[PDB]
Design a protein around this ligand. Structure first.
Ligand SMILES: CC(=O)O[C@H]1C(=O)[C@@]2(C)[C@H]([C@H](OC(=O)c3ccccc3)[C@]3(O)C[C@H](OC(=O)[C@H](O)[C@@H](NC(=O)c4ccccc4)c4ccccc4)C(C)=C1C3(C)C)[C@]1(OC(C)=O)CO[C@@H]1C[C@@H]2O
Ligand SMILES: CC(=O)O[C@H]1C(=O)[C@@]2(C)[C@H]([C@H](OC(=O)c3ccccc3)[C@]3(O)C[C@H](OC(=O)[C@H](O)[C@@H](NC(=O)c4ccccc4)c4ccccc4)C(C)=C1C3(C)C)[C@]1(OC(C)=O)CO[C@@H]1C[C@@H]2O
Ligand SMILES: Nc1nc2c(ncn2[C@@H]2O[C@H](COP(=O)(O)OP(=O)(O)OP(=O)(O)O)[C@@H](O)[C@H]2O)c(=O)[nH]1
Ligand SMILES: Nc1nc2c(ncn2[C@@H]2O[C@H](COP(=O)(O)OP(=O)(O)OP(=O)(O)O)[C@@H](O)[C@H]2O)c(=O)[nH]1
Ligand SMILES: Nc1nc2c(ncn2[C@@H]2O[C@H](COP(=O)(O)OP(=O)(O)O)[C@@H](O)[C@H]2O)c(=O)[nH]1
Ligand SMILES: Nc1nc2c(ncn2[C@@H]2O[C@H](COP(=O)(O)OP(=O)(O)O)[C@@H](O)[C@H]2O)c(=O)[nH]1
Ligand SMILES: [Mg+2]
Ligand SMILES: [Mg+2]
Lengths: 426, 10, 431, 426, 431
């Protein structure tokens, strides 16, 4: 039935996508050569959601890899799971955005967007019933933010009735990876808030905290972070590939999570997360998964939900469970923490159950929360933006690409408008 | 350098 | 892919280039004759013939002795014969000679060679230029060459690794004149300029490497290590890659402030390597101590505008984040208020390589640190003072005037320098 | 049904808890790895009182490890039975109290209490019907006294209807292990008397006396002392795990023990205690146990009850006995030894019987007496505290942590009022 | 976990440090080169390289002779080269030179090294300082270092091992000046300060060990054994652990009275070892004779205020309690009335280790005792008396004044000492 097209922009997007495709292939029993060697018919039952079929049993993932510099996906091609992708989906530029939003949005993106759209259209024509699009990117870099916003705008123009999901990497609150990181982020949101159906915000600092404190990893690398992100990505869309007691696809999640069009930023989570030394000390059950999901420490965005109130919540369980247990756990959570839920929405939670567990685990759960506490992050970014724009720091880099200060003013005004809306609805 | 131009911005 | 072109001019530039190319050949496993005994190094080396790799370098001087030393050295069969361009009479420490009288004789040939080398590249990203401020050929011909380049290309980035004059150590009398003139004429034609001081490197070698006789070879080896760590992200792959453009986008807040300072860590000797574990946190801390900066200026006298860290080898991103946070909380360092986020980080997998017969010990990780701070303003002031001392009495002015430099130019340069100093004082004040 | 959460603070608490959990595990037939290898169904019938059940037959004690320095709990972790505890329950600081009540109650305890309370709450929510809490500590140390007082206050605020029991190592009357023993002791009592339900007082010197005169041990270590302390601990709550002819839980013991809210300091004792050579010469019958329990030399508190009068008494027998013999012994004790029983309470004795012998014994009995002879201990502590406080000795150490002399004055006044009450009721 | 830093100042400090570090390396089985031939010793040693352990020690002196002795000895490759800091001219038994003129030259470098070592620790709890009152460098630089440490940190403990001047044996003429000045300066910056007396240790070696030629090696070995018994509770686990903070919480009743006395038992020779079956009670008794004290003063002349016992090896808590009770009931010793509970006791499993070539036999149990007593007041009085005898005629005063120390400072110091004497006689009176 439905099918999902995957987009992949920038270095962060490319690495997350590589890990995500390795995880997906391992889940469906496909070797890196692209030949099916699974054991259960359910792997091929809905394999068309992500993988095409070519003459000779080989499977081609329905993905597009885009970057303005060739190094990252050159490494992707050279490394493992590089022969699985069709080479026509590798789109490269020569210059690179150089952490400049304007360069990646107006100059290099303007050159590459036609080829990327041609590839997207060709890939989506073979689709039988397109469900939507997935995008992976970061709001800090130039290529990611700029070309992602451009692609999203063009797609929303082309396919207004489809679904767009983005897995962004929002800037961290403590330590930055880029000096101009504020500017780009704001310039990104001014587009995202208008063109994206739903966005899941991911913070690297929260992932470091999870890996250190919970998983007890002494040396967490980007591989582990992308592993966690890929686990969440797989958990979100599991109801499209396996049968379950209660089903939920992308459209239903969107319907349940956007009370108003301008509020589509959520904070994802996952459970269970245990090390290889304390996993035998705990028996995983539905109450354990529920308690780990509703933990401010377990959130994948560096934003405490206890400072605000939830609007809506989604819980996607994987494995064999009892509907009564899920319902009683949700009722108990809503009763105990009733101070963190808006009064003008009863039954904030929406649940889905998928029969097929993650390969190896007994049970699992994915949490998606739409909390007003995110406004904190938003206002923080705005603050830093102003702290720079008062002195015109690094402004010449952007204004030499054709952008004008009125664009910065508009972006800041819209950013503050969104913050005010989030405050009012709380 | 024109660092004093936008200090009056709200 | 992305290609970088290197230009080395003057005695200092040529010798630093020799050290840099020896380091590159050693790191990439290329023999001095251009053959590989056993490929991302297309960035620096092009393939010509059967298995021969030719570096993309141009060596320029108005005096043939140092280039002749190159032509008869161990790397004679490595460089293209036409890439080594020589004059007959040097600028003789005279900026006007290397700018107006002697430079214009071979500037066209140098530009022709550069164009021929650049047309081959498909993804050219920028130019590397090595020179010195005090020298006549260095300052004069470098200024002329960058003016010509900025006219010809404009969009491509241009970088310098210049030798700033030392506060006390000097090897010329006409040094302030040339330094001021070349800074004034290169201020509007550059994107980023990394500067080092011979005195600071002497102090580093004495304090850390425990070398009592630091000849120019050791200094050039350290500088080459820094350049290699800068270009590593281009020459290899890592968890977080930084090309040349991101440097200028992240370290240059205003077009007239593009003079960062370059340090390095860990600079330790062989015997003390056993007593120390080179962890990420401690080398990050060492990169920020004033005693390790390779320009004789105290960071504590000013405030940082932007900082860039480049890690090599065995490095974990969480440790990098923790160390940067710890540096941020510490109040021994100061940051401008209008720059809440003042760090750009890059991580690469390739560890540094120790040149045999060298002075640095073998380590698994290293950091290159670039900082754009107002602490350099003091240095500028000092230079200006010296200029004034020698210009109130018209000392040595006739030497420059006789070569076609009108006198008012000097005033212009001084005026511009004053304005530049004012610029720093304007951005060093919080709001 | 009823379930108990166990907490220990400080070096004494950690050591006693380690010995106690080893004793309990051997009683229920659980190997050090945590996998049940017993031989009776009763060992699992009510094992939920102390052990949660993990995945794969493993059982995890419901215990919390609290200390301000990591040496003691590191030794606990590395030693035997160190792999039976959940590693998340180990809570350690870095500074350490340094034998300072103020440092562990206001400065370090303030930092650690949040995490410890989070762990305690997480443990408690998994309890079906929580019965109460157990604490083990000493009134002479800094970490034990201060941090335990802070936890008791916070827990009483959080759970006002549950049961709080403490095992306190009161300072010895003859030889002190710490110079600042007076101050800390008072500063604990002034809080304990307000927040705890019942407290058993044990003196190390009395234990030395017991293992020297009775057990004929030449070289008693802290191992033996903790061993019989844990024997008493197990004897107290044996009715919660095995059926008996007449059983009593913690709440009934509290109801029958304390006549007034400010009198909850008991003196425990255990019987039989014989050497390895004299076990072959004496008959083990109910009168033997009853005569040994009501013996001055057999008490675990260094205060002779012959100087005062009992208020209430509890006798928890264990094994296969006859109710007629138990009641006849109680009548005989109350009749002949009537000189030290209060006149305004008839039937000072409350008896319980547990069918299961301890592990490999025939009969045993635990004694808990609420005597008015503990006023001697309070007199002595008051005298020493006032003698030290008159000259302001060591006072700057406490006042440099934030406290003031008003706290010392009010603590001494409150505990002197307790002295007056205990004297008046006799 | 919990970390400690050892500081050694002057000739006496450096020699005692060498003995202590040899003893620690032997105890933990570390070869002189830093390797291990086969772990709670992270308190003193930091891991580095491939299984190399570097002590957390800093060696400071204003003369290079003794540090160079260390740098060429058997333990040359054990210490980090940057931790041995030397000046060029010593204070020459001048407090002013070591405190004002010479010490200020290297105080900054010493503090830099101190903070570099301190940042490496996660749970640092205190510093150990070894020095001497009589010397110039010792007293002056120790006072300066304590001032700087108290200003920088403030909360961490600072314990002191110091060589109190002997009542009769003297090795300098200006001992009273230096002692009074350093005591006045450091009186409000040391949390606790144990003392040893060279004359007392000479007496101990003569009476007990049957040695007639006790070079400084024997005295330093004794002191190292004592400090090992103090820090064993950190380095090993025991039935009753004692931290560094507990010492000061239990032995200092007032901030101005922090001068305990250190003893050790058993001190016997090998020949007499076979004829004495040493037990806990007899060792506890032996620790209380005046003849076994390591400060030449009679405790029977004063009253104890607090006592600390540290037991090692085969020790049973019941025997400890019985012995301490017997000591308490014995009326030949006295305790202040306002301290009814005057004992702290700690027990450790690991027995003391016998250094080969030493002069102490092998025992399975040992006791270290520290007593804060008023009998030390007499010693202060004697020192003050000597100071007056030398100050009425202003002998040697010009030597101190010429280094910048104002004359009135002397008066302050003397007056302060007077107050301290009064302090003791105020707390030695029962009520
Ligand atoms: C044998 C066994 O049961 O051991 C587990 C295991 O020990 C743990 C730690 C696994 C393990 O995961 C990690 O080691 C890990 C480390 C850092 C970050 C992320 C993961 C495991 O690798 C993961 C692996 O999971 C799978 O096989 C799923 O299919 C998983 N796929 C992958 O992780 C994967 C990795 C490389 C290439 C292809 C797939 C998955 C998870 C979520 C959604 C889709 C797929 C399993 C169960 C284990 C190991 C082997 C140790 C965990 O896996 C996940 C993400 O569910 C980490 O959190 C769980 C908890 C498990 O107890
Ligand atoms: C048949 C018989 O009487 O054998 C006894 C024994 O001889 C005596 C002397 C035992 C023995 O205990 C001691 O004398 C003792 C005391 C301190 C330190 C070491 C040993 C015994 O060790 C004790 C041990 O008792 C037990 O095993 C109990 O279950 C005890 N648990 C443990 O001792 C234990 C050991 C290892 C690991 C975990 C627990 C217990 C009792 C009540 C409540 C909980 C636990 C046994 C069989 C004996 C010996 C071996 C001599 C006594 O111990 C107890 C508490 O039962 C001393 O008082 C009793 C009286 C007994 O007569
Ligand atoms: N670090 C370093 N500095 C050098 C080296 N060689 C020369 N210099 C610097 O160059 C300055 C002298 O000017 P030069 O660069 O030699 O002048 P030039 O390039 O030969 O040009 P002319 O003056 O016309 O001959 C000195 O102050 C040195 O500091 C070198 O090998 N290493
Ligand atoms: N117990 C003991 N005392 C020592 C030792 N070495 C020196 N001393 C004492 O130190 C005193 C002499 O002063 P120094 O320690 O040499 O003074 P300094 O620290 O070197 O500083 P300067 O006076 O400037 O030389 C003598 O009275 C000795 O008692 C030693 O190894 N053991
Ligand atoms: N989680 C995660 N984040 C990444 C990864 N790589 C880069 N990032 C983030 O992306 C930002 C850098 O942007 P980048 O995509 O490299 O710039 P671009 O090349 O212009 O698109 C940094 O803030 C990083 O935190 C990755 O592998 N995983
Ligand atoms: N019965 C018993 N008493 C102990 C044990 N360990 C320590 N103590 C007592 O506890 C007191 C020391 O308190 P401690 O816990 O070390 O101080 P803290 O670090 O502040 O908690 C001493 O008076 C000891 O008599 C033990 O294992 N058993
Ligand atoms: Mg030259
Ligand atoms: Mg000396």
């Amino acid at each position: 039935m439905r099918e999902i097209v995957h987009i992949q922009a920038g270095q962060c997007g490319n690495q997350i996508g590589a890990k995500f495709w390795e995880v997906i292939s391992d889940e469906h029993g496909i070797d890196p050569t692209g030949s099916y060697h699974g054991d259960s018919d359910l792997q091929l039952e809905r394999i068309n959601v992500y993988y095409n079929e070519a003459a000779g049993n080989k499977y081609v993932p329905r993905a597009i890899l885009v970057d303005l510099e060739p190094g990252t996906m050159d490494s992707v091609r050279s490394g493992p799971f590089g022969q699985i992708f069709r080479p026509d989906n590798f789109v490269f530029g020569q210059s690179g955005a150089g952490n400049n939003w304007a360069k990646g949005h107006y100059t290099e993106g303007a050159e590459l967007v036609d080829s990327v759209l041609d590839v997207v259209r060709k890939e989506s024509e073979s689709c039988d019933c397109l469900q939507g699009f997935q995008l992976t990117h970061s709001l800090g870099g130039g290529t990611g933010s700029g070309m992602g916003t451009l692609l999203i705008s063009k797609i929303r123009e082309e396919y207004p009735d489809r679904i767009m999901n983005t897995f962004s990497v929002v800037p961290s609150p403590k330590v930055s990876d880029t000096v101009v990181e504020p500017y780009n982020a704001t310039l990104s949101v001014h587009q995202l808030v208008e063109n994206t159906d739903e966005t899941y915000c991911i913070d690297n600092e929260a992932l470091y905290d999870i890996c250190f404190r919970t998983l007890k990893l002494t040396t967490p690398t980007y591989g582990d972070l992308n592993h966690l992100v890929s686990a969440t990505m797989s958990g979100v869309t599991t109801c499209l590939r396996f049968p379950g007691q209660l089903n939920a696809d992308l459209r239903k999640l969107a319907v349940n999570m956007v009370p108003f069009p301008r509020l589509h930023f959520f904070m994802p989570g996952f459970a269970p997360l245990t090390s290889r030394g304390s996993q035998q000390y705990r028996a995983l059950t539905v109450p354990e998964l529920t308690q780990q999901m509703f933990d401010a420490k377990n959130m994948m965005a560096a934003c405490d939900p206890r400072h605000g109130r939830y609007l809506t919540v989604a819980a996607v369980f994987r494995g064999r469970m009892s509907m009564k247990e899920v319902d009683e756990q949700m009722l108990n959570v809503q009763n105990k923490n009733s101070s963190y839920f808006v009064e003008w929405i009863p039954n904030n939670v929406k649940t889905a159950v998928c029969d097929i567990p993650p390969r190896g685990l007994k049970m699992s759960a994915t949490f998606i929360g739409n909390s007003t506490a995110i406004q904190e992050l938003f206002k923080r970014i705005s603050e830093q933006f102003t702290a720079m724009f008062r002195r015109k720091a690094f402004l010449h880099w952007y204004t030499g690409e054709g952008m004008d200060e009125m664009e910065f003013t508009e972006a800041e005004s819209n950013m503050n408008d969104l913050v005010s809306e989030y405050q009012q609805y709380q | 350098c024109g660092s004093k131009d936008n200090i009056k911005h709200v | 892919m992305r290609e970088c072109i290197s230009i080395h001019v003057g005695q200092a530039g040529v010798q630093i280039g020799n050290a840099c190319w020896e380091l590159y050949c050693l790191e990439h496993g290329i023999q001095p004759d251009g053959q590989m005994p056993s490929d991302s190094f297309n960035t620096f080396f092009s393939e010509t013939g059967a298995g021969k790799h030719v570096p993309r370098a141009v060596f320029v001087d108005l005096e043939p002795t140092v280039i002749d030393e190159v032509r008869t050295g161990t790397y004679r069969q490595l460089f293209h014969p036409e890439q080594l361009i020589t004059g007959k009479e040097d600028a003789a420490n005279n900026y006007a000679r290397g700018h107006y009288t002697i430079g214009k004789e071979i500037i066209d040939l140098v530009l022709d060679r550069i164009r021929k080398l650049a047309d081959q590249c498909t993804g050219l990203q920028g130019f590397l230029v090595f020179h010195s401020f005090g020298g006549g050929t260095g300052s004069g011909f470098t200024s002329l060459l960058m003016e010509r380049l900025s006219v010809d290309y404009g969009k491509k980035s241009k970088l310098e690794f210049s030798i700033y004059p030392a506060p006390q150590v000097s090897t010329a009398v006409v040094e302030p004149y040339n330094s001021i003139l070349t800074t004034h004429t290169t201020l509007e034609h550059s994107d980023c300029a990394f500067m080092v001081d011979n005195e600071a490197i002497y102090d580093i070698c004495r304090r850390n490497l425990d070398i009592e006789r630091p000849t120019y070879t050791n200094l050039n080896r350290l500088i080459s290590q820094i350049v290699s760590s800068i270009t590593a992200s281009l020459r290899f792959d890592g968890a977080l890659n930084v090309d040349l453009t991101e440097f200028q986008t992240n370290l240059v807040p205003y077009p007239r402030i593009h003079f960062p300072l370059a340090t390095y860590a860990p600079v330790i000797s062989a015997e003390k390597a056993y007593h120390e574990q080179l962890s990420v946190a401690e080398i990050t801390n060492a990169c920020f101590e004033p005693a390790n900066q390779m320009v004789k200026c105290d960071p504590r006298h000013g405030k940082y505008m932007a900082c860039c860290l480049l890690y090599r080898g065995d490095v974990v991103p969480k440790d990098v984040n923790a160390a940067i946070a710890t540096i941020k909380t510490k109040r021994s360092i100061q940051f401008v208020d209008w720059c809440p986020t003042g760090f750009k980080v890059g991580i690469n997998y390739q560890p540094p390589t120790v040149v045999p017969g060298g002075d640095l010990a073998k380590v698994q990780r290293a950091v290159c640190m670039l900082s754009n701070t107002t602490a350099i303003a003091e240095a500028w002031a000092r230079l200006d003072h010296k200029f004034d001392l020698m210009y109130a009495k018209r000392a040595f002015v006739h030497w420059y005037v006789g070569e076609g430099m009108e006198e008012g130019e000097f005033s212009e340069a001084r005026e511009d320098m004053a304005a530049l100093e004012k610029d720093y004082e304007e951005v060093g004040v919080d709001s």
